[PDB]
Amino acid sequence: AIRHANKATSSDEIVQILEEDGVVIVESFLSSDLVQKLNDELDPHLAALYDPVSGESAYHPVTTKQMNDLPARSQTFRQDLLNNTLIHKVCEGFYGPTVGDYWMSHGGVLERGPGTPIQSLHRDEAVFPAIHSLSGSGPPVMLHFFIALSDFTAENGATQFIPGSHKWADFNDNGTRDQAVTAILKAGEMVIFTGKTVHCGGANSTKDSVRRALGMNFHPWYVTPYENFYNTPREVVESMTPLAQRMIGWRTLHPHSHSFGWWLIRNAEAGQALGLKP
């Protein structure tokens, strides 16, 4: 009951489906070559965090991996995803008039292989109780772009959603499990959802298949990003476009409310104060 219908569809209708249902499925979002390039850049970094041989150390049953600080690690994430026209058109439409500017809070590759337990139904914006307590009347905060780096089946745990749960008057009700619809995704096939939408990841019943995803969680300008990107090497930041630099917090935000800017250095543009080109 999640409408995909997102190839010839305009983004304004994508924003409309996001407003009505709280979740939308974008078909054919990433080219299969883009998925292969992303998986190739991402594999070494993941393999180097998780050594299969371990002398107990932390622990052996590894049903789950995930990784962030993507801009330092992946060029294709650095350029293609952070500058993607559809992500930004949907971001501008979702935040709308009163917000104005936005930046990325969290960019992560998530992997759950065989034996992964099913998740509880929840809302990510529960991490901000002052916003969460307003329930469905609250302002837009989190926007989540979930790219499928592998097939997304009900059998390896396709993520489930409850459409319309972003409008509920009481967010202490996370709904029930018979209200959840699974999101089947094949190649790039992104799914977009709000931080107010009830959802849960599925169980990986398979003995053999690993679910892999790339989550891009965006914030309005006034909400603190989860990730700090200042240890990113300066040459990597200087290779990025100013839009992508603003996404990772190296440029000032421009809310229309406070038109003169936010996240400034001596009331001046920040990245320019620390060596980036104007």
The footprint of its own copies (CB under 8 A) covers 33, 36-37, 40-41, 44-45, 47-49, 51, 53-57, 72, 75, 78, 232-236, 239
Q: Which does 124 bind (CB under 5 to 8 A by kind): its own copies, Fe ion, none?
A: Fe ion
User: Which pair of tokens denotes residue 85?
Assistant: 């026209």
**Based on CB atoms, which residue is closest to its own copies, 14 or 240?**
240
**Based on CB atoms, which residue is closest to its own copies, 33 or 170?**
33
**Based on CB atoms, which residue is closest to Fe ion, 193 or 229?**
193
CB of 58 to its own copies, least distance (A): 12
CB of 230 to its own copies, least distance (A): 13
Give me the residue label for tokens 């998780």: 50
CA separation for the pair 209, 152 (Å, rounded)? 10
Sole binder of Fe ion in the list 21, 101, 111, 124 (CB under 5 A): 124
- Computed from CA positions of residues 117, 118, 119, 120, in that sequence, does the dihedral angle turn out positive or negative? negative
Residue 26 pairs in a beta bridge with 190
**Based on CB atoms, which residue is closest to Fe ion, 111 or 124?**
124
CA separation for the pair 41, 232 (Å, rounded)? 17
Q: Which does 165 bind (CB under 5 to 8 A by kind): its own copies, Fe ion, none?
A: none
CB of 143 to Fe ion, least distance (A): 13
**Based on CB atoms, which residue is closest to Fe ion, 159 or 232?**
159
CA separation for the pair 3, 221 (Å, rounded)? 30
CA separation for the pair 202, 63 (Å, rounded)? 13
User: Which pair of tokens denotes residue 163?
Assistant: 């459409």
Q: Which does 170 bind (CB under 5 to 8 A by kind): Fe ion, its own copies, none?
A: none
CB of 115 to its own copies, least distance (A): 20
Residue 119 carries which DSSP code?
Answer: P
Chain centre distance of CA 266: 32
Q: Which helix (H) or strand (E) holds 132?
A: helix 129-132
**Based on CB atoms, which residue is closest to its own copies, 36 or 176?**
36
Rule CB under 5 A: is residue 125 a binding residue for Fe ion?
no
CA separation for the pair 12, 25 (Å, rounded)? 14
CA separation for the pair 101, 174 (Å, rounded)? 30
Task: Give the footprint of Fe ion on this chain (CB under 5 A).
Answer: 124
